[PDB]
Amino acid sequence: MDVNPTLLFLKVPAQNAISTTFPYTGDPPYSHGTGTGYTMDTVNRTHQYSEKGKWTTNTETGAPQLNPIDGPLPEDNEPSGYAQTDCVLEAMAFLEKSHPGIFENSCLETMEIVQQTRVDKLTQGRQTYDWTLNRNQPAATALANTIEVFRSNGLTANESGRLIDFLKDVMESMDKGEMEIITHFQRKRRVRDNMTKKMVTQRTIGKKKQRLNKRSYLIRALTLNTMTKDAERGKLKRRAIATPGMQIRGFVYFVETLARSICEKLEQSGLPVGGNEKKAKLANVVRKMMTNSQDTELSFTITGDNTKWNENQNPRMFLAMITYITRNQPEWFRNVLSIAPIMFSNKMARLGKGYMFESKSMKLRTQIPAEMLASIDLKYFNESTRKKIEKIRPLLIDGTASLSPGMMMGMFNMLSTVLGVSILNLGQKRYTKTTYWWDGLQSSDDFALIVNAPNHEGIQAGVDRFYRTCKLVGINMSKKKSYINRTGTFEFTSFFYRYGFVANFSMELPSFGVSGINESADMSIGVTVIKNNMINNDLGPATAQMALQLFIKDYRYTYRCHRGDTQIQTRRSFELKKLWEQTRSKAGLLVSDGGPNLYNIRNLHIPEVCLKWELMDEDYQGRLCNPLNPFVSHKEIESVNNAVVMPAHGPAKSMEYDAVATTHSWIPKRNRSILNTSQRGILEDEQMYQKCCNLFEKFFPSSSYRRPVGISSMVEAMVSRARIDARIDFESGRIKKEEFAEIMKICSTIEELR
Amino acid sequence: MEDFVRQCFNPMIVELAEKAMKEYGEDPKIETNKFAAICTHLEVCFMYSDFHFIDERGESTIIESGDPNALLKHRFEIIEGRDRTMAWTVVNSICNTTGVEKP
Amino acid sequence: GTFGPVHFRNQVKIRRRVDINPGHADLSAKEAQDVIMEVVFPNEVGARILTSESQLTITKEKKEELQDCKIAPLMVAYMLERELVRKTRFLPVAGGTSSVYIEVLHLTQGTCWEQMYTPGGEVRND
RNA sequence: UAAACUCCUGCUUUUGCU
RNA sequence: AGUAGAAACAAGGAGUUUU
């Protein structure tokens, strides 16, 4: 007979079996080539939905940017970023009138988070865009390259450990024209050999000077790198994700600090937390809308979504918000939050890599950079891409594209959500002064709305009042991907809701397996993922001892460590049996080297070796009790018990895991493609230094537990300790005070080297 | 003046107050008075300290040599002029090897 | 610990920020790192506030326990830090919300069912 | 010039030099 | 050819020798 499984929704309700319609089992779509065609199809789409603002021209930039807000009102259902400043302020002047005193309260923690934060808060995160090398360097090396730009510039003024003078000089860096950056290029030498009398070559790296301008640094200071959103699910196309620059996120950390602090004091943004508080907030307001549930009301919910949510923002009304939610605040504080919506409203996206061309005659390929797109024989392109260049060939400045309207992904959330919930604030009945009233929630772009009114004519008059309210601020709800129905059935970032009881089925299971960080610490996080998702993401009992049963089956395939009772063969089987026949504790031996699987769903929270400890005979764990451990390299507190495992709710999330230090917690291999780049000199200089920076960090005890923040000059820094190491050993100690004089003698001998 | 700080003094007190001023954000010396309050104060710190050693018998005297090559030791310990780490490091290093309360 | 039989009752879970393993003395998270900073090596504390009187005895007990461990790494220090961190994580708690019941939280609660669960140890007095 | 052999790399191969 | 899907891979990268 003909078999289809999608007919079992004829019996099971759709929100109870909705996980069958999540193809999260196959691979996600990847972008293959670039994002150059994807960035230009967003700089076009931003300047199409905002096409009627006045085209200014920036003074220090040369950018022909668009100034789209408080322009002509939209007069169709096509989305439009023409936001009304006298309604952005107005719809969140009603944010304080519902929840009183939010803004000056929430600034006051933000005025204290600004007064205790180092620069180290911005060196953690995603890979960023440095401006020195014009490339996605990761978040440490981009920060620790731009700082010695200032040191190789005249004015450092930043080395005081706090980031606000680091956020003073990034404004001041836009004053010094000659920005003498560092360039290193690769050369060769010629040495001899005395043993074999042969004369061979040797590789080394040179040094080169380079300078900038004020129409060349300011672009690179305001440059967003545009990647492609790899491994997004649920979209046939792709999209550009934006990587903010190095200077930008310093100001942006304070802006989302404030803006997250708003949403934790509000109660309709599920975003500042994880998914479990979101299920509370979701099912909160379905009951909050049964507060005024009269004898005859009609309450239709809206399973909303916002289409083109990122292009139809504008950081010019972000500046309108954070000028208003910092009312009567100090002058320095209102200023420092204000730089980030300024340098998003002059931001200049790069155009990615470029395009790969193909000869159908000479059988040759090549690829141009994205910068050559200002000057190309336009018949090199097919008919679709040729349309995309001509609509933004006026916008190419210095290989970038001036994109002042619109945000885009990977840059900033949680303040446009504050905007998006403030319209949902306005449906509170004290503000409507009519029979219809609404409330709901607002995620990043997927919202859910519940409106009520005493007949269908009221709801119809209540839905569009909301829709024409969101049009005043550039929030354009997806008329494709949204619908209305009565209460009890909606979704909200795929948290489906059936009459009261949510089925999660969002970030379903991309992992459930060996997410190899180590060999033990991906079992300790392995059995934690089955543990945590019995709580958070709601998998039941039998699938928890299936996702454990199979977790081990590919824990033993990646790490080859099958049992001895399986007589199958791999790189070792024989000396495992030495552990089998000698240890009287057969069934307590550890499983990262061929043991039984004592785990079940009574004991996931127990770690691996602390589970298998009250059974082992003294030899094995005593062979594991060796604290020398050439296989550990005892980490730092930010990296002790931290793996970066991505959900589908956010860009990244670190989650911890009870991992005992053991010989199986080793660090995996560094990638070696940097050895063949012409960027070798960023490694051979710096590979020698964490050999010896941690030789200093032996001499402080708390340096491997706390950040050491003192004077500069690491060589001068330990000798200040060495002479206070000296006297408390001199006044009292076990060692002789003549060997003290040897400790004395080294100190000036350091200074005898100038 | 800050030129008077640069001229009629020695640069060892100036530069150690250059690092000591680069702590709160007044880095181009726009104060020019707390830049002048501390450089006067730090010159007291060296004139209260130097040309005094600690002998083997324990007597208080002066020695006109002044050439340690890190072989002789002083009697007053320089704490002001160090950083906020290195101050509290030396402060706590006294209170742990003695019976002194912590300030 | 001892298990009870299955009480087949439905799940009406409550999703509240509930504590995970706070441990001893209910000390502040920075103040938790303060007593650890003493016992790792005392000369790096920088604590403008010394301690309260209740911390003055409990750090003296922890002081000799590190020599009682072994010639010990620094990692024995920041696991004593881990039993003092009061973690408060919002979790759907269908049942009791205590730092002895919070580590299981999945063994006990569910779909058609609850699992009655009595872990061993000292049932408290306060 | 066209053929073969020689070393590195498999996320850093997105691009700045001589 | 094939994979693939709005742009890609189908080795990249360094050396030597012969119209």
Determine contact: A604 vs chain C, CB below 8 A: yes
A228 touches strand E (CB under 7 A): no
And the tokens for A716? 């001068």
User: How many Å apart are CA A580 and CA B7, to the nearest integer?
Assistant: 81
CA-nearest of A109, A127, A125, A105 to A117 is A109
Cross-strand pairs, A225? A243
Determine contact: A541 vs chain C, CB below 8 A: yes
Q: How far is the CA of A186 from the C1' of E19 (A)?
A: 36
CB contact under 8 A, C44 and B89: yes
Helix axes B34-47, B11-21, angle to 10 degrees: 130
- What type of residue sits at position A348? M
A356 touches strand E (CB under 7 A): yes
User: How many Å apart are CA A693 and CA A706, to the nearest integer?
Assistant: 15
Strand A354-358 relative to strand A223-226: parallel, antiparallel, unpaired? unpaired
To one decimal, the resolution in angstroms is: 3.7
* Distance from the Cα of residue A9 to its chain's centroid: 37
User: Chains with ≥3 Cβ pairs under 8 A against A?
Assistant: B, C
Q: Return the DSSP state at A118.
A: B
User: How many Å apart are CA A500 and CA A502, to the nearest integer?
Assistant: 6
Strand A223-226 relative to strand A348-350: parallel, antiparallel, unpaired? parallel
Q: Contacts of residue C45 in chain B, CB cutoff 8 Å?
A: 88, 92
Do A380 and A212 touch, CB atoms closer than 8 A? no
Q: How many CA atoms lie within 13 A of A258 on its CB side?
A: 28
Determine contact: A745 vs chain B, CB below 8 A: yes
CB contact under 8 A, B70 and A711: no
A237 touches strand E (CB under 7 A): yes
3-state secondary structure labels for all residues of A433-471 = CCCCEEEEEECCCCEEEEEEECCHHHHHHHHHHHHHHHH
User: How many Å apart are CA A716 and CA A747, to the nearest integer?
Assistant: 10
Determine contact: B57 vs chain C, CB below 8 A: no
Q: Which residues of B are annotated as a binding site?
A: 41, 80
Summarize chain B as % helix, strand, coil (round to 5): 45, 5, 50
User: How many Å apart are CA A354 and CA A244, to the nearest integer?
Assistant: 19
Q: Which residue has the tokens 């003498």?
A: A180
And the tokens for A641? 């018990």
User: How many Å apart are CA A393 and CA A400, to the nearest integer?
Assistant: 10
Residue of chain B nearest C50, judged by CA positions: B102
Q: Contacts of residue A548 in chain C, CB cutoff 8 Å?
A: none
Helix extents (H) in A427-571: 429-432, 456-470, 526-532, 549-558
Determine contact: A172 vs chain B, CB below 8 A: no
Do A218 and A207 touch, CB atoms closer than 8 A? no
The DSSP string of A290-346 is: GSS--SS-EEEEE---BTTTTTT--HHHHHHHHHHTTTT--HHHHHHTTHHHHTTTT
Of all helices (H) and strands (E), which one includes residue A208?
A: strand A208-210
Q: How many CA atoms lie within 13 A of A549 on its CB side?
A: 6
Residue of chain C nearest A500, judged by CA positions: C12
Give residue numbers, 23 to 82 of A, with CB < 7 Å from strand E.
29-34, 36-38, 41
User: How many Å apart are CA A517 and CA A566, to the nearest integer?
Assistant: 26
Do A274 and A435 touch, CB atoms closer than 8 A? no
Do A471 and A77 touch, CB atoms closer than 8 A? no
Q: How far is the CA of A40 from the C1' of D9 (A)?
A: 33
Q: How far is the CA of A198 from the C1' of E17 (A)?
A: 21
Q: Is A183 helix (H, G, I), strand (E, B) or coil?
A: strand
CB contact under 8 A, A710 and B83: yes
Considering only CB atoms, A744 lies closest to which of B25, B70, B82, namely B70
Q: How far is the CA of A677 from the C1' of D17 (A)?
A: 12
CB contact under 8 A, B96 and C46: no
